[PDB]
Paper text:
The gram-positive bacterium Cutibacterium acnes (formerly Propionibacterium acnes) belongs to the phylum Actinobacteria, and is one of the major inhabitants of the sebaceous follicles of the human skin. The amino-acid sequences of exo-acting β-mannosidases (EC 3.2.1.25) are found in any of the three GH families 1, 2 and 5, which belong to the GH-A clan that features the (β/α)8 TIM-barrel fold.
The crystal structure of CaMan5_18 was determined and refined in the unliganded state at a final resolution of 1.8 Å. The overall structure displays the, for GH5 enzymes typical, (β/α)8 TIM-barrel fold. The enzyme was co-crystallized with mannose, however, no clear density for the sugar could be identified. Although the experimental data do not show bound ligand in the active site, we can derive from close homologs that Glu140 is acting as the acid/base catalyst and Glu259 as a nucleophile. The conformation of Glu140 is supported by interactions with His215, and the neighboring Asn139 is kept in position through a possible hydrogen bond with Arg41. The orientation of the catalytic nucleophile Glu259 can be stabilized through interactions with Arg41 and Trp217. The enzyme is present as a two-fold symmetrical homodimer in the crystal, featuring an extensive dimer interface generated by five loop regions: L1 (residues 46–57), L2 (residues 89–92), L3 (residues 98–102), L4 (residues 152–156), and L5 (residues 299–314), where especially L2 and L3 shape and stabilize the active site (inset). The C-terminus in our CaMan5_18 structure (residues 396–408) is flexible and lacks interpretable electron density.
Author numbering:
A (entry chain B): 1 to 392
B (entry chain A): 1 to 395
């Protein structure tokens, strides 16, 4: 199994793209490579790549490639998220899609034409770099359709289920057309798993792109319900992956745990190492799991304001570049993770019913319901991750 | 009076701040100064200056100073709009003020603290350039409070009349604290003159900052009502300036026609020279008028998409730098404009009733109303710009 990090530049965070300092980048990647990690996930900014729909900036693309080549110096494999878009509570949107220029980020024909232009130019650059493996359409881009009572986007783009599929096929198809050897994905917060009317569905997750992705974040629901120190905190990503496996009709469908982390809302600094060890140990046996990518590489500088406070301390390194206790715990897990001892599950899968075409009824799997509490209870008592099963 | 241009970079428009090519900037400013123009208005981009509330980028400030000094090489006076903010239908907003981070651009205490920080660092840099004269708060920044039926901002910030005053006093106060020798202004679209419940009022306009500013655009209302070729199109800026004079209780209050232009919705290319000369002739006698600034210096490149189409052709120059017919017409008017022969107006001012404290009733002055129609009628009949007079309503 591959083990890597979501790259959050220590100097400048993603605002570093405006004043790119490749030697500072190299010091970040040296640290990541020193831990034993083998890949990073990169996040270029949409307003810098494409400040007007007809202006895809060549120097912005040059900057992306410089960072790709810096990672290659330290033998780090790279994937790039194309449309960011959304990062750590902030939306990076070019002026031609906001306020007076509002349209629909999933169905407006000119917006889609701009998105495919940017994605095509990115893919044409990235296919030439030997350590670049592929692209994700954008970081949790489906949140621009979020409509849940506790998480609904303030300038939401209306979108049907079929609209969502057509948008994915357009973006992923453009990547494939320009970069046939690449692998391509989309990623999303867990509204896709848990919100019945969310237009991006589990069907989309297990059928579009090269692997099913999961982002696993316990601070919104799992932590509030179950609390600090509870086992559900460390079983959550395995649960999400078993849910992804339950939804798939293909036993060969690979999985990528593209985001997982330890929010200090419910995992104190002094529990972080143990959280890293317990979480990682419960993932090694996951069938089909190709990679785990930690959020994030480096603490966000406290000189940057207005983040939700949990975002600042998600790094494996402090902002000054010092490895944190969970960083060393991760290095120790790398042999077990690389080898990934399969365990063939002979359990009785916990069943749930939910609609394939529409995603209706998927809220039965929510961390607030009985099914997840029962899953965690059985995983703790047996020590073995239960399978899940979607009634046919 | 002074005559200048709102600077719209030919190579890349305002997106040129990301890839600043000072030799391209020199080429634009050379054309502007060759015409006889003596100043420019500059628009730095808020997301570039302050991508995070805690990060005012010194390299972005350096780039602003570089353009100020490039204009000094052609003896061009400079003012800088601090918070942009709004430019030609586009909003340039840092991520920390939008969507999940939405607050209030006029009343949120942390937003204001961020705004004053940026304004202070800008003022501190600009006060050391000899050709920099002052700053405007931001281009038409009150449009973030717009609430009119035909013009309401889709993510508007709720704001009272007193909120508006407090915000201006905070921003303008910061500029004066850091740059005592400077002159400072705010500018606005004509909602301030014409929309009864717009929280920025004519009272604010004639009392805050160093001079009353006017932006004069005929495409939204004057053109549609009166049509191509009508005299109302060329009288409109003088009307607005006489309205500004009427609201002011101070005869010494200066005026700045900070934006005026010739939109092709109602002024064809082949009418632009005549529009320029007629408009400018009706302005030379305006009491207190210190400067006129044309929107804009250079046509927007058609390689840039999704602009309202009228925005592309507002330049004095084509995008590749050829002077347009109105540019040469303006160059001829320059002796008459520098000399600015005053005229004592001995007329009976046309009266209107509106509220000084709240701005209520100011819509009687709208280009859709009878007052503006009679003003134009009398101006055409006599050849003299009529004065206006405010009768303050009780409350």
């Amino acid at each position: 199994m591959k083990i890597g990090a979501n790259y959050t530049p220590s100097q400048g965070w993603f605002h570093s793209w405006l004043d790119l300092d490749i030697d500072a980048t190299r010091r970040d990647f040296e640290g990541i490579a020193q831990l034993g990690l083998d890949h990073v996930r990169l996040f270029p900014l949409w307003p810098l790549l494409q400040p007007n729909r007809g202006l895809v900036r060549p120097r912005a693309l040059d900057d992306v490639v410089s960072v790709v080549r810096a990672a290659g110096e330290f033998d780090l494999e790279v994937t790039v998220d194309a449309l960011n878009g959304h990062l750590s509570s902030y939306d990076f949107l070019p002026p031609w899609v906001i306020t007076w220029h509002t349209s629909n980020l999933f169905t407006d024909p000119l917006v889609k034409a701009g998105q495919t232009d940017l994605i095509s130019q990115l893919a044409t650059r990235l296919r030439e770099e030997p350590n670049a493996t592929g692209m994700t359409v954008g970081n949790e881009f489906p949140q621009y359709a979020a409509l849940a009572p506790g998480h609904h986007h303030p300038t939401r783009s209306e979108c049907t289920v079929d609209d969502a599929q057509t948008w994915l096929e357009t973006m992923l198809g453009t990547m494939r057309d320009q970069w046939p050897d690449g692998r391509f994905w989309f990623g999303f917060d867990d509204d896709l798993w848990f919100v019945d009317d969310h237009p991006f569905t589990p069907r989309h997750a297990v059928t579009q792109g090269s692997a099913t992705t999961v982002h696993s974040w316990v601070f919104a629901q799992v932590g509030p319900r179950f609390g600090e120190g509870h086992p559900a905190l460390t079983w959550f990503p395995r649960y999400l992956l078993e849910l992804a496996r339950a939804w798939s009709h293909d036993p060969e469908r690979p999985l990528w745990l593209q985001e997982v982390g330890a929010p200090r809302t419910h995992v104190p600094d002094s529990s972080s190492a143990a959280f890293m060890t317990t979480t990682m140990a419960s993932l090694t046996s996951t069938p089909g799991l190709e990679a785990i990518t930690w959020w994030c590489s480096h603490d966000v500088s406290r000189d940057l304001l207005d983040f939700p406070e949990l975002e600042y301390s998600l790094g494996l390194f402090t902002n000054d570049g010092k490895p944190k206790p969970e960083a060393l715990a991760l290095s120790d897990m790398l042999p077990d993770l690389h080898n990934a001892q399969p365990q063939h599950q002979l359990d009785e899968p916990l069943e749930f019913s939910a609609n394939w075409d529409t995603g209706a009824g998927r809220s039965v799997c929510s961390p607030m319901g009985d099914l997840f509490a029962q899953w965690v209870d059985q995983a703790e008592q047996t020590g073995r991750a239960p399978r899940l099963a979607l009634r046919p």
